[PDB]
Amino acid sequence: HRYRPGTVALREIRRYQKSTELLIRKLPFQRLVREIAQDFKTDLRFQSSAVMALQEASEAYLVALFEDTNLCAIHAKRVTIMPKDIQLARRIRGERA
Amino acid sequence: PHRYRPGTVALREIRRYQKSTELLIRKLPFQRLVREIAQDFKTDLRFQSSAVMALQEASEAYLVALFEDTNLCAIHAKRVTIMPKDIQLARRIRGER
Amino acid sequence: KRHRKVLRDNIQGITKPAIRRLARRGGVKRISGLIYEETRGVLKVFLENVIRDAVTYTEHAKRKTVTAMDVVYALKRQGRTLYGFGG
Amino acid sequence: NIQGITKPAIRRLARRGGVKRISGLIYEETRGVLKVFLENVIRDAVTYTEHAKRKTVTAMDVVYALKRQGRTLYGFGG
Amino acid sequence: TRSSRAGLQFPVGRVHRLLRKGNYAERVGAGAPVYLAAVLEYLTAEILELAGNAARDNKKTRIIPRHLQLAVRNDEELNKLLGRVTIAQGGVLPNIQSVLLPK
Amino acid sequence: AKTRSSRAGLQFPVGRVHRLLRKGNYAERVGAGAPVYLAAVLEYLTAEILELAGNAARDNKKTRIIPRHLQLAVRNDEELNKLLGRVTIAQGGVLPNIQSVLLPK
Amino acid sequence: KTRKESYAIYVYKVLKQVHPDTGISSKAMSIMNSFVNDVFERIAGEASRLAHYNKRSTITSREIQTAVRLLLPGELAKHAVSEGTKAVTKYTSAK
Amino acid sequence: TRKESYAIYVYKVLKQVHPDTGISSKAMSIMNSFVNDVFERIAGEASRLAHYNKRSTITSREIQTAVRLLLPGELAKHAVSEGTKAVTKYTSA
DNA sequence: GCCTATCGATGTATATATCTGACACGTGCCTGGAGACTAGGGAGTAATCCCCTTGGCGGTTAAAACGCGGGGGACAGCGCGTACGTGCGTTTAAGCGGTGCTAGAGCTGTCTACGACCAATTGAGCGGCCTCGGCACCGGGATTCTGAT
DNA sequence: ATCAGAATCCCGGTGCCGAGGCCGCTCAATTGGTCGTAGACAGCTCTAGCACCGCTTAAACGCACGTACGCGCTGTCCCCCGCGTTTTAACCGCCAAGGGGATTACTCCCTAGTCTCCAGGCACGTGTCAGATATATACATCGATAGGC
In chain D, domain spans: 1-78
Quickly list H helices, chain C: 16-25, 36-60, 68-76
Q: Where are the alpha helices (DSSP H) in chain E?
A: 2-5, 12-21, 31-57, 65-74, 76-81
Experimental method: cryo-EM
Q: Is B80 within 8 Å of F93 when comparing Cβ atoms?
A: no
Check CB contact of C82 with chain F, cutoff 8 Å.
Answer: yes
Bases in strand I with any atom closer than 7 Å to a protein CB: 9-12, 22-24, 31-35, 42-44, 52-54, 63-65, 70-75, 83-88, 92-95, 103-107, 114-116, 124-127, 134-136, 146-148
Domains of chain E by range and CATH? 1-103 (1.10.20.10)
F34 contacts H62 by C-beta, under 8 angstroms: yes
Name the superfamily (CATH) of residues D1-78: Histone, subunit A (1.10.20.10)
Q: Which nucleotide is nearest to D49 (CA to C1')?
A: J101
The amino acid at C25: R
CA distance G57 to C76: 22
Please name which of G70, H69, D47, H55 lies closest in space to residue E23, comparing C-alpha atoms.
Answer: H55
Q: Do chains A and C touch (3 or more CB pairs under 8 A)?
A: no
Residues contacting G95, CB < 8 A, separation 6+: none
Radius of gyration of chain G (CA): 16
Interchain CB contacts (distance < 8 Å): A and E: 38
Cα angle vertex G66, ends G6, F29, to 5°?
60
Burial of C35 (0-12, 13-18, 19+ CB in 10 A): buried
**Resolution expressed in Å:** 3.1
Q: Domain spans of chain B?
A: 1-97
Q: E13: which nucleotide lies closest, measuring CA to C1'?
A: J29
Amino acid making up residue B14:
I
**d(CA B2, C1' J146) / Å:** 19
| D75 closest CA partner among A58, A34, E87 | E87
> In CATH, what number is assigned to the domain containing residue H85?
1.10.20.10
**Helix/strand/coil (H, E, C) string of chain H?**
CCCCCCHHHHHHHHHHHCCCCEECHHHHHHHHHHHHHHHHHHHHHHHHHHHHCCCCEECHHHHHHHHHHHCCHHHHHHHHHHHHHHHHHHHHC
Which residues, in sequence order, are CB contacts of B33 under 8 Å at separation 6+? C10, C11, C13, C14, C44, C47
Burial letters F38-70, b for 16+ CB under 10 A, else e: bbbbbbbbbbbbbbbbbbbbeeeeeeebbbbbb
Residue A48 CB-density burial (10 A; 0-12 exposed, 13-18 middle, 19+ buried): exposed
| Contact call for B and D: 3+ CB–CB distances under 8 Å | no
d(Cα G42, Cα H53) in Å, to the nearest integer? 20
**Which residues 6+ apart lie within 8 Å of B31 measured at CB?**
B47, B52
Our measurement of CA C18 to C1' I115, in angstroms, reads 56
Q: What is the Cα–Cα distance from F69 to F62, expressed in whole angstroms? A: 10
| C-alpha atoms less than 13 angstroms from C-alpha of H82 in its C-beta half-sphere | 18
- Strand ranges (E), A1-97: 45-46, 80-81
Q: Which residues contact B68 (CB under 8 A, 6 or more apart)?
A: C26, C27
What is the distance between the alpha carbons of residues H11 and H23, in angstroms, rounded to a whole number?
A: 8
Q: Do E87 and D74 make contact, defined as CB atoms within 8 angstroms?
A: yes
- Pick from H65, G47, C66: which is nearest to B50 by CA? C66
Domain count, chain H: 1
CA of B76 to C1' of I77 (A): 20
- Give strand letter and number of the nucleotide nearest G6 (CA to C1'): I126
Residue G12 burial by CB count (10 A; 0-12/13-18/19+): exposed, middle or buried? Answer: middle
Closest CB to C81 among H26, H29, H37 = H37
Query: Phi then psi for H89, rounded to 5 degrees?
Result: -85, -10
- Report the length, in residues, of chain F: 105
Residue C50: CB atoms within 10 A of its CB come to: 25
d(CA A48, CA A54) in angstroms, rounded, equals 10
End-to-end C-alpha distance for chain G, whole angstroms: 39
Nearest CA in chain E to G30: E65
Check: CB of residue G27 under 8 Å from CB of residue E64: yes
User: Residue G32 is inside which H or E element, if any?
Assistant: helix G26-53
Tell me the sheet residues that pair with G59: E28
The residues pairing with E87 across neighbouring beta strands, listed in sequence order, are D74
Question: Does the CB of F79 have a partner CB in chain A at under 8 Å?
Answer: no
Tell me which chain G residues have a C-beta less than 8 angstroms from the C-beta of F25: 48, 52
Distance CA A72, CA B90 (A): 10
CATH of the domain spanning C1-87, picked from 1.40.20.10, 1.20.810.10, 1.10.20.10, 3.40.50.300: 1.10.20.10
Distance CA A12, CA E96 (A): 11
Q: How far is the CA of H3 from the C1' of J120 (A)?
A: 15
DSSP D3: G
Alpha-carbon distance of A95 to A73, in angstroms, equals 19
A1, HSE (Cβ side, Cα atoms, 13 Å): 2
Tell if the CB–CB gap between A94 and F85 is shorter than 8 Å. yes
Kindly state the helix (H) or strand (E) to which residue D37 belongs, with its residue range: helix D26-50
The parent domain of residue H70 ranges over: 1-93
Compute the distance between CA of residue G15 and CA of residue G8 in angstroms, rounded to an integer. 11
Q: Which of residues 42-71 of B touch C (CB under 8 A)?
A: 42, 44-48, 50-51, 53-55, 57-68, 70-71
Instruction: Report how far residue C22's alpha carbon sits from residue B25's, in angstroms, rounded to the nearest whole number.
Output: 8
Closest nucleotide C1' to the C-alpha of C16: J60
Cβ–Cβ under 8 Å, residues E26 and F25 = yes
How long is the CA B33 to C1' J138 vector, in angstroms?
47
